[PDB]
Amino acid sequence: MGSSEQELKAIVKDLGCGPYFLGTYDKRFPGFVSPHKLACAIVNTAGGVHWMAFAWNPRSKTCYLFEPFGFSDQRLKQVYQFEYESLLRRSAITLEKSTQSVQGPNSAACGLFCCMFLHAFANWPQTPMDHNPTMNLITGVPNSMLNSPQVQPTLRRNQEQLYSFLERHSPYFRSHSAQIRSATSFCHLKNM
Numbered sequence: 777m778g779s780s781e782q783e784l785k786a787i788v789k790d791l792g793c794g795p796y797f798l799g800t801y802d803k804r805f806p807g808f809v810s811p812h813k814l815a816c817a818i819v820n821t822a823g824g825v826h827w828m829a830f831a832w833n834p835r836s837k838t839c840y841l842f843e844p845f846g847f848s849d850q851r852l853k854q855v856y857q858f859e860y861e862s863l864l865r866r867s868a869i870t871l872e873k874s875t876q877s878v879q880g881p882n883s884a885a886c887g888l889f890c891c892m893f894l895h896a897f898a899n900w901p902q903t904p905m906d907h908n909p910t911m912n913l914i915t916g917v918p919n920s921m922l923n924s925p926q927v928q929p930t931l932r933r934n935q936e937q938l939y940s941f942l943e944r945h946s947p948y949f950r951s952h953s954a955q956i957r958s959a960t961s962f963c964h965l966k967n968m
């Protein structure tokens with residue numbers, strides 16, 4: 777179920793993020809960011825779901841945290857606010873976090889959505905969250921309504937947009953398309 781670190785690494789490389797990508801991390805951010813270089817990373821917040829994306833723009837001095845569930849989990853939000861502050865202390869500034877949900881609650885596509893955000897960051901680091909060709913494919917919904925029936929079609933359309941984007945941009949995804957689709961499916965966690 778979900779996506780492995782090696783899957784995500786292969787897709788991020790296909791998407792052209794390699795020059796800025798620091799790796800995949802277990803629970804913690806990367807050790808440091810540099811005042812001189814764009815950087816991004818994927819963090820497993822649990823230690824094949826629980827994926828969040830990190831990015832850093834040294835020119836705007838902005839850290840981005842992309843979370844498909846809009847930081848609707850208050851403990852997760854608290855943890856990573858502190859991680860941000862600690863990262864700045866190790867590195868010697870603004871944090872922009874997701875505020876709306878783009879993924880269905882029964883989906884296991886978290887890691888894939890993080891890859892899509894990293895494409896957006898690598899290409900439009902001045903505006904990675906929204907108002908760019910990649911993220912404009914995806915629509916956020918209010919967190920309080922994440923579990924409401926009426927938003928599920930929007931969250932499903934987001935996932936369809938995600939898969940179609942990956943088919944166009946990632947040879948790895950094409951080579952593993954049916955497998956990854958099955959493992960990450962929109963209702964992987966609901967069978968009613």
Ligand code: NA
Nearest residue numbers: 911912914915
């Ligand atoms: Na969008």
